Structure formats: structure tokens, C-alpha cells
Subunit: 386 residues, 4 copies
Amino acid sequence: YQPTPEDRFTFGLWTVGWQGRDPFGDATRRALDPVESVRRLAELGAHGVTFHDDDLIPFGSSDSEREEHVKRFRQALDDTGMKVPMATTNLFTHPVFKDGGFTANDRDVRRYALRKTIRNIDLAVELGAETYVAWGGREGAESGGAKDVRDALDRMKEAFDLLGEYVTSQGYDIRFAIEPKPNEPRGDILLPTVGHALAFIERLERPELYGVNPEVGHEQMAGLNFPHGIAQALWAGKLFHIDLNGQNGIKYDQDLRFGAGDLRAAFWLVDLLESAGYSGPRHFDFKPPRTEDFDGVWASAAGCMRNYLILKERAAAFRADPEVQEALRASRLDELARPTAADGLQALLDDRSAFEEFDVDAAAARGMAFERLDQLAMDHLLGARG
Amino acid sequence: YQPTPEDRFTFGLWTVGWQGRDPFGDATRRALDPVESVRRLAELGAHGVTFHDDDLIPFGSSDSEREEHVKRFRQALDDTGMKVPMATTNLFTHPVFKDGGFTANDRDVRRYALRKTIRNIDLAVELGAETYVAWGGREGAESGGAKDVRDALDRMKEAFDLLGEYVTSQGYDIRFAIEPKPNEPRGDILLPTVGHALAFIERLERPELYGVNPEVGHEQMAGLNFPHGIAQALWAGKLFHIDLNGQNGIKYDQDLRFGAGDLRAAFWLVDLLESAGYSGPRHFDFKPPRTEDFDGVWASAAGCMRNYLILKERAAAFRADPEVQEALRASRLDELARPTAADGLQALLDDRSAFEEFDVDAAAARGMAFERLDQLAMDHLLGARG
Amino acid sequence: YQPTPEDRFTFGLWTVGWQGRDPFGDATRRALDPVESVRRLAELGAHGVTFHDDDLIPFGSSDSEREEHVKRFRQALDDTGMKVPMATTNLFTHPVFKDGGFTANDRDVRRYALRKTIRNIDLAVELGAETYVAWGGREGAESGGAKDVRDALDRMKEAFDLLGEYVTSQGYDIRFAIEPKPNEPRGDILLPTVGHALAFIERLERPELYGVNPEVGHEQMAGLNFPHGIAQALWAGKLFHIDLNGQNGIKYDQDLRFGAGDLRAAFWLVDLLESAGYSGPRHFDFKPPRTEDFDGVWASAAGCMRNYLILKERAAAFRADPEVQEALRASRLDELARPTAADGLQALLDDRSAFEEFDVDAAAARGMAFERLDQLAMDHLLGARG
Amino acid sequence: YQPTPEDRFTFGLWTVGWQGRDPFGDATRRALDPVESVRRLAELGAHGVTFHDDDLIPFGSSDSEREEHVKRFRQALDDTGMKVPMATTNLFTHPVFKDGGFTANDRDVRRYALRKTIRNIDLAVELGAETYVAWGGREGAESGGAKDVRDALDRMKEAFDLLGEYVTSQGYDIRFAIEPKPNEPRGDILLPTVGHALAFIERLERPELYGVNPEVGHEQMAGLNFPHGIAQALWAGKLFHIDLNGQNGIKYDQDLRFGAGDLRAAFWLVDLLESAGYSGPRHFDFKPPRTEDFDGVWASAAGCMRNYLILKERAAAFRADPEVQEALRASRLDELARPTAADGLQALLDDRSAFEEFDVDAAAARGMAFERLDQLAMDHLLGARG
Ligand SMILES: [Mg+2]
Ligand SMILES: [Mg+2]
Ligand SMILES: [Mg+2]
Ligand SMILES: [Mg+2]
Ligand SMILES: [Mn+2]
Ligand SMILES: [Mn+2]
Ligand SMILES: [Mn+2]
Ligand SMILES: [Mn+2]
């Protein structure tokens, strides 16, 4: 289960670089130099890195300091062959963003937020990024009166429409991906799930430029089925990117390494991504627990890729097993793929065998054989059969 | 706080008619005759009633029995002035629907499901229904392999597209509303939240015919902010109908009476619906607890309308208070309504006061005064000020 | 992974006998004759069966009908060698119990509840039961005023104290186990978790007679860590019995087959039960999904035992691996077992190396090597190493 | 609704002093000088203040700096009349505590943890503290193998037993209160709810010295009913202290101001505390949202006390209303207070009216009239009746 750059595993600078500051505790690890993360990630077999603007260029840097940070970063990429497939903006850490970026009540912060984003889009494109992610972590509210959500959605649409106008006027070959999250650090965050984000995209001026970057743990923070939500994003043609990690249920955003948390959901997710032919980055938005030294940071990053490769192998065996193929037919998964009424509304309406002569009681008695199917998947996940 | 038919309160037959059968218990109340619910609801001041097909016509009835049930129902409506503003299909109770209706793996059940729906649409329209609700309570899965969700969404789109073709070919003046629910009775239900439903509607052949019927407790079963989700449905022009009730957090679907559960969320919801001018039915999808006799059933139904009328009065006082108007300006809610960059992308890009000369530290120091605002809302909800 | 009676797997009659009636649906399966469940469970390798009174003797039966049901049941046990290690009372299904059994507000129902329990204790003992379980599924409330919880706890203590007085006066060799559940079918249930039940037991007149029967899915319905709670029950000497099944997070009580739901939690649970030497029944309180025919019912029951046997093997390999032993020492699990201050309070107070000369910064820098440990456990669970 | 020191409202230094550092953001407020919090809290009508050691004495201070901080603090108390009713230790912020204090795997950290606690107990007593709180926020684990929970409970019992030996050998008149929390900042925290803490206390060497300090939002983070859990702590004689705040359901620990979050639960809580005669501090463990300036900090602190005083008035009106007294009798709350079988086990066993001549069907038909009762409570909370 050795990872190679062909597996397209990527990592954010903020992930292995997380110092371990949490709400009740100080940092337990020293800051990594972005250049040293590039090199150690390359050694582990990573395909690329991603970044917030403020991960690479310290907030408040002059153009002269900004340029020097980009230079040393670029040389590290050239020496390693490291790709930069995705970039994003930090619109949440600085106190100025305490009520949001794009949907802050203060108009001047919103304008500032857009200028800060536009500047990092330039850098992202120059560096090779295909996807630009937006996580609106501060867009939201703790109390009901603080935020008129219709106006806030107007302001959110205004911001993304202006970003779309910017990139098309520049001729940049980049798309946007909204990363939803239901809560934390705001009591409720706008566009809280994959679904709300997908619906919002349809009201943008150029919807074709926008998709989602769903994260395993965020959907699970709402008790949702992450594979199902990924299937809906794929069905809509909107899975531009994906954040992989682990989460144990409805609580604070844990960002555990991928495979931890809900193990069966991770299996069904890999099964879907591979059998659907998803070809984008397998990105890990995770946090090595602050109990770990730097040896643990790299072991946790390596475990991310290792668990994906193991689940990939197990899912492929599950689908390739002829006992499983026969179980799928016994559950009538193949009939799910058949149009319900390709004969048309009229034909269906004049089909007495569909309602008048329908033997409802004989149909009710068929078993779906779902448990036998599910035990075969369990056996394959656990390796009790190949 | 007396309810009148002008308040547009409606109730499902299955609500006050709930006998109290729960997963671990037998019915504690006798079945109500639909005609007797119409009359007692009329006496309480209800505006109308809604129904599943199987609430009015016992499953398996002949056309002769079907017709006689509709007759006595219609006379009750004529005698009372009761409206029937919404109707829906029961595609979940009968064992034949154990793997779904529109997305059952068995093709013949899916065809049956559509014929059963189409037949009740005719009745709904003849009876005056403006909205036809679809709750896909059985569309979903307990295990990951049981359901290919991309195919299931194809089958779901096929079903609603055929319903849209039916009603437009008949010239019916009726729209559809999808009622989302995240889980129960399936482990995970398809289209689990308002957002997923809104996104799905955009891929239908005639999206203008379809909106959502959100329910207070269902969104709350995913830990979501119901007012926020209602604001997004209103923003999209898709709030066709609404289910009001109460729910205490993330657990089984309680269907408590409206006002119970999350009381502040009910206040912010009423505030939004009234200040937005929502003009559809205020429908209560609730269940009188099975501890109650028939006196408790009607007291619980009356409490639904009473709590709405009380919250309406308190929300109107909150908005009409000049101290609250001044608190709203102190929090810059009025600036949220101002376009971020109506001067355009070019102007914004050449505005040095938006990024180059932006005093980020002075902006960071502004307080949003959200707590004072929220205490004023609390005071108004509790009646510690008028 | 073949189960034998030595593995002590047991099943309730109500589990494989679940007809599939859920809150929104009718039964999808015919009722099993208790004698036929005994025989098919024996064929699968089950060690024994458990029952509610009302599973074996239909509610309202005369003594003559009661006796005949017990007779045919007993012959089935004698023919198979089937044990009856645990029994319990149904104090939740009948409408008379709609506000509770032991803590119903009506005094006459409480007296009735105790007489019904006492009668089944006699039968349980005559049949060989070592453990008598109490699940107070109706003890609780939907609304805050319905139940004075201090008085209800007085009534709960009164009931169990009287049961303890009964069994000791009869000389029965049986203990009680409280099965906690946080909610469903009541909005909130009294003694909602393992912890509350353990604390309550300490205020009974004879605490030594009472322990807990925790269920995987119930603790998980509160977002709790089930292995941790089992460790606390073992630490207190109170794990009398255990209910094994599966649950996907905070939602309705799913009662999936064991291994489904949270797979890693099931691994850590088996690891604990085996390395602690738990010798009681491995009981499955689960529900074959109502999508299944009778073939699926038995496949689901067999999967319960199969997943336990697979996790047992994987946990034993994890603990037996010398790489894991060395990882445990690297994380200082062995030092956790060392008394903190066996030298005493005085010695500790005069130890300058514990506070005055303590190098807090050097201690802060140690990594706990938890991720490497956890990846070894993952590898063992998945079978990527033996 | 003006608060006076007679109302016994207290606040932690860390509450109004919270600078607004959250997991994704930097501080938005300057640090308050402990002396300035004492004075402004006194002006608002607070009864007293509480503190962690590290709130008053910066970590790593010499005895000379430690003494000077205590001096200026004490003068502020003397000038104001401010009480210090409770104190606690910070065993979670410093990186040395990243795997726990009392249950850290490293034995030397555990010894350090006890010495740090013992030193602040001296100060607490000298300052007048009646209650010493322990929040074991770092005692726990992210992964299953990191922590043997039986050993960790041994180490937890060892620590509290040594604290009990210390305070009794010194003759201090102080008791301990464990503050439970289910998760955050560890994935799972030991003693996660009021119940687990109550059960653990019973295994300490001197249980009479230990009770609980429950927090509104922590129990609610597990979906539990906080009033019910408070009733169980009162029933056991263990409510030594209480943390009041607000929380919106199962998510990160919000620490909103009291009254926010679940408003009806706050009403039922106040109703219980007042009708039970709880006489301890009404302590607010809350966090002014980081959107606020210092005006908002004090408005949020004032709102804490204001909402308590408003709910107190409404609960007293509810109980004093003769319509509510009559509703309580209609629901048979008075019969809940009657012993079930004060006539004894023998009498109960020979009472044919309790089982043989029990009219189960007539009893099943009684309604509990819970909804009418609950609407009266709603009306009182909202002020739709006095
Ligand atoms: Mg992410
Ligand atoms: Mg509904
Ligand atoms: Mg059970
Ligand atoms: Mg606290
Ligand atoms: Mn995350
Ligand atoms: Mn509902
Ligand atoms: Mn269960
Ligand atoms: Mn808290």
C-alpha cells in the first residue's frame, strides 16, 4: 500500500502545519516552514500541496516580503515536482473577519474581503491551481437578529458573481468550489451542507464555474450520509474537489486522519469515488492530534494515504467478486438502473398491470436480500474473503 | 389570541387522527372519522384540512367505496366552509413500499407508486388543492450497497418529471412541494434537507412547478437552523408550503405541537414568515402525544394556533420597537442590505480605500452590538417590554 | 468463523421475531412461533434465548393458556439444549403503560406494574435465568411539567427495592440489570445513560443485587463512547449483561445487526470485553430490517455472531503483535497502570522533582505516539497485517 | 429585574475575560485585568467571582510575583465586598497537559498535576472558597488504544482520594465538585455526563466530600435533558454548584449567555432550582461572543442575570396559579408523590385489585392531560397570563 504521485493525494499546508492551538490550549508544536512541508510531503509520495494565502504570506506583508515568500516556495515546487492543484483564501482568522468576509454586515469589510480573495486568485493561477476553494467559515450568526439571511445570500451571490466576472475577464482556466460546513466557529454557518451549496450555485450568474468541495467530517457534523451527498454532487456534475478526513459523529470539527471516525462510511465513499471515475485530487483536510510530535505528524499524514489505498483495494474486491455481483442482482440493483416508464406517460396510464392488475401483496412479500449483501461488503472490508 | 380562518391555519387528517401507535406501543386512541375531524377543526377556527389518499379512502377500496368516502367528506367541507389547500400520497405505510415508492429497486413498484400518486392528484385538484406534497419517507437505505444513489436520483427525477408532464397535459393549476427529512423510517432518506431538495429541483424538466414543504422538526433532526433554511427557500422563490411543529434536537421525529421544542427558533421563524409576507397555509404536521385523550388532542391542536398567534404578536412588537430599530442600525443590519460593489469590478479594483488604504485594525475593533440586540429580542419574546 | 454454544451468543425472541411494524409502516413479516425461533436459533449455533413476558404469553391470557404456552416452550428448550440466561418484562407496549410502569403518575398502574414484573420473575427463575433486565422505556416525559423527577426517582427506587425484597425473601439466585436508553419512545427517558443508571443503583437498599445491561446503540444515541462506558461499568463491578447491536449516530434507535453502525467502536468493544474476561452472555438486541424476508432474518442473526467472531480474532492479533506491544510502551500505557503517588501524600508534597524541579517544557515536548499506535490497530482491523 | 448580591450571581474571571481566541481565529479583545473585572462585576450586581489559578497568577510566576498578584486581587475584593465562592485549577491549557492531568499516561505529569492543584486549594481556602471545581477537560482520548479506561479511572480515583486526604488533614472546610463534559477538546472526555460523575463519586474513599458542578451546555452537548439531570443530582444530595449558560444542541461548546440556546429548558431549570431551594451560587460559565466589544461583554454578563430573574418570576407565577395547581392534580402529579406500596410487599402481593381485579382497559383510557398543563406553562413563560 505504497502511495505514488499517480494516486493524486494532496495536503494543505495548514494540515501538517497545524501547531495544535485549540479552544482550550496553546500550541504543542513549532511552526513548519512551508518549504519543509513541501519536501517532506514529496518524500511521503504526495502529489501536491494546497494553501491559504495567509499560510504562505504572513498577514500584513509588503509586496517585497510577499514576493520573497513566493520565490522560495516556487523553488521548492520545482525541485520536487510538487503540484499546487488547489488554493483558497483565509477569510476567517483575522479579527476583521469576525462577522464574516463576503457577508459581514460592514460593507467595507466585504469590499476588503473581495480584494484579498482576488489577489490570491492571481497567485493561485500563476502557480498552477485548477480549483479555487471558498470556505465561508465566518459567514453566519450566533443569534437570530444578527443577520438577515436573505440579504446575506444577496451579498454572497454578489461576491461570487464578481469573482466569476474577474476570472472570465482575465481568461483564467480555474473553477470555484464551495466547501460547506454546518457550524463552528459560527453558531450556524450559511450554506451549511452540500445540498444548500448546490442549490445556491444554481442562482449564480455563471453556474458552470462553481461546484462543491465537500468534507467528510462536515456533512457528518449534521448527521448526514457523506457517500449519499457525494452521489448527489456527482449526479449534478458538481464534484470539483473533495476534502477527506475522519469524524466521530455530531460534535466539534475533529479533522481526524482519513479512515478514522466512521470507517464503513469511508469504505462506501472510496467505492463510490472509484466506481464513478472521480479524477480530481484526493485532498486531506485533517489535523494531526496535538498529542503528537513531528514523528506523529508524518505518521498521521502517511496513514491518510495508507487507509485510502487499503479501502480502494477492498472496494475493488467487493465489486469484482461474482458472489457480490449475484447478490446485487438478488437485491434488484440492476432494475434500479432501468427507466421506470420509458414507454411514456400514456402507456403507463393504460397499463393495467401497473395498478389495476398489480398484485400488491405478492410484491410486498419479496425480500430485498439487503443483509446478505451487506454482510458480503463487511466480509470484504474486513478481509474475511477476497 | 383567538384563531380565525383568516390566519390560514391548516391540519392534516393524520395529525389529530393519530391513534398513538409508536414503535414500542399500541394505539391509545380510537380512529377519528374524517368527517368528525373536519367539523371539530372548523369549530377551533382552522382554515382547512389536508390528507393522504389512504387517510380518506382505506387502502384497497373499490371505486364504489372510494366514491362514497369522497362524498361524505365533500359534504362536511360544504357544511363548514373548510378548504382543502394541500394533499399528498401515502407511499410509505403499506409493506409494498418497504424499499421506497419512486426509487424502489423493483421497477414494478415504482410504476405502481406513480399510478397511485396520479390518481390522488385528480382528487386533490377536484377538491381545490393548490399544493401537492411529496414526502419520500421510504426512499433511502439502511446499508451502503442497497441503493445506488445516482440511479436512485435518476429514478426520482423520472418520477417527478412524469408528474409534471401529467399535470401540465391536464391543465391543472397545482404545484408540487417536496418535504425533506434526513432519516426515519429509513436509516438515511434521499434529499435529506431543504438544501438537497432545492438543488434537486433545479435538475427537473420544469423546475418552476416544484418547491419545498419544509418541516420545523426535520431540519432540526440534522441540527440545522430552520429559520436560515426557510430564508434560503424564500430567497430562491421556492417556499410553496410549510409544516409547523416542535422538536427537541437530534433524535427521533417527535412532531410536537408548534411552539414546543426550540422556542426561540419558533420566534425567529414567525418573525421571518411575517416580515417576508409568506401567504401560504400555516400547516401543522404534528402528533398529539399518545398520553392524551381526545380532550388533549383538541387542546394540543388549539395550542398550535395559539402559540403562532402569540409569537406573531411578540415578533411584530420587536420589529415595531424604536429601540430595536436603533439597535439594528448599531449592528449595521441596514448596511448588509447595501450592494457590496455596485460601482463594479473595475471601480472596486481601483479603490485603494478597499485594500491598500484599508485600516484593517480599526475595522477589527468595531463591536457588532449583537448581544444588546439579542437581549432586546429576548425581552420582547418574554414580554419584559412592549 | 463458525459460532458454537461456547461463544455464549444469545438472542431475544422479540429480535428475530420482529415483524417490522415501525412508526410509519405496517408489519412486513409474519409472527414467528417462539418454539420455531428456539429451534432455528439452535441450528445457527446460538447459546440461548431471552424473552419478555408478553413475547411468550399473549397479554390477557388465563392461567390455563399461560401454562400451555410455557409447556411447549420448555419442550423446545429441552430438545435443543437451549439456555434461557436472561428474562425481562414488557412494561411499555400496552396502552396502560403510556405514562410509565414504575413511575407512572397513576398509583394503581405502578402497583399493577410491580405485580406483572413479580410474576415473570418466578417464571424466569424456574426457567434458569441468571439476570433479570429492566428497560424503563416509558419512564419519562415529553414536557417539563408532566413529571416531577425527584418524586419519580423515589418511585423508581421504591419499585426496585421491592423487587430486591421479593427475590431475597424467595431465595432466588438472580440479579437485576437496568438497561439505559436516553430517549424514544418518551421524549426523555429516566436514567438515560450507563452513568445515570450506575449512580442510581448506589442509592438502592441492596446495591449488590443490581447492575447494568448497556446497549451499543443507546449510548451512541447520546453521542457517547460505548467502550468507555463499558469500561466504567466493569471498573465498578456492574457489567451484569450487555446488548450488542449497531447504530449510525444520533438518531432513532436503529437496532442494526452487530458490526454495522460504528465499526471501529465495535472493534474496541470486543477488545475490551475479551481482554477483561467478561463471561456473561453476548446478547443481541437487534432488529432485522423490515426490508428482509425470513431468509434475511436468519442471515442477519448469523451476521451478528459472525462479526463478533471476526472482531475477536482481529483484536487478539492486535494485542498479540509485538509491534503493538512496543507501540503501547512508546505511548506509556504501561505507566498509566503505575500508581501516581504510592509513596503517599507527604512524600509527594516533599518531592521537589514533582513541581519545583519539574521540567514542564521537556515534558510538554514528548510525543504520545498515539497515531502510530492507532494505525497499527487500523491495520489489524482491516487485516493489512497479522 | 435588577440583580442584587442577594441573588448570588457569580462569574468566572475567564468568562468576561475571554479574549475571543477560537479554533479558527485570533483574539478580538484585549485582556482584562482581574482587578478591573472584580470592580465592573460588582457594579453590575454580581455576588462574587471565581477563578482558575492561571487566570490570576500567570503560569511560571515566582512566589514573589505570585504574592503580588494575590495582593492586588485581595484589595479589590475588600473594596467591593466581592465574595470568592468557588475556585478551580487550570489543568488543560499548557502543552504539558496535552494527554490529561490526573490521567495523563506519563506518571510525572500526574504528580505535577496534583501538586499544582494542591497549591491552588490553599489559596482558594484562604480566599473564602466553599467549593473547589475540577473540570477534567484533557482526561480522555481521540483513539481507542491511547487510554486504558479502567486504569485511567484508577488514576482518577487515586488523584481525588489524595485531594480528599489533603483537605481533611489540613482541616479545610471545602468540598469538591466535578464538572462533567462529554467531549471537546478531547474526542471523548472521561466522566462525560452528570450520571457518570455521580457514579464515580460513589467509589471514592470519602464520597461525602464530592459532588457535581453540572453545566447547562455540556449535558445538552449529549442531547440530554438538563433539568432531569439536575433533579437526579439533587435527589442524590450532590448538587454542590452549577454552571449556567446557553447551548443550541449537539455541537461545539458554545457557552452562550444564560437564557440563550434552549429557552424552555432554562425555564424548567429555574423552576426546579427555586422550588427545590437550591442555595448555592448561580454561576455563569459563559463566553461573550467574539463579535462583541467591551460594551457587549458587560451587556452579555448583565443579560445572564436578567434572564434568570425573568424566568424566576415566570416560574413562580406558574406554580402560584390556581389553574396550574388544578392542572397538576388533573395530571396526577400529586399521586406521583404517594408511595406505591407503603402497605408492603406482602399486602401488595395479596391485593387482587392490583392485578387480578385490575381494570387495565379503564386505566388505559385515562388521559394524562399533559398538553393542557404544558400550554399553561407556555402561557406563563410568554406572559400571556399572570
Ligand atoms: Mg476543508
Ligand atoms: Mg410533514
Ligand atoms: Mg435492549
Ligand atoms: Mg464550566
Ligand atoms: Mn473540518
Ligand atoms: Mn415530523
Ligand atoms: Mn435499541
Ligand atoms: Mn461549556
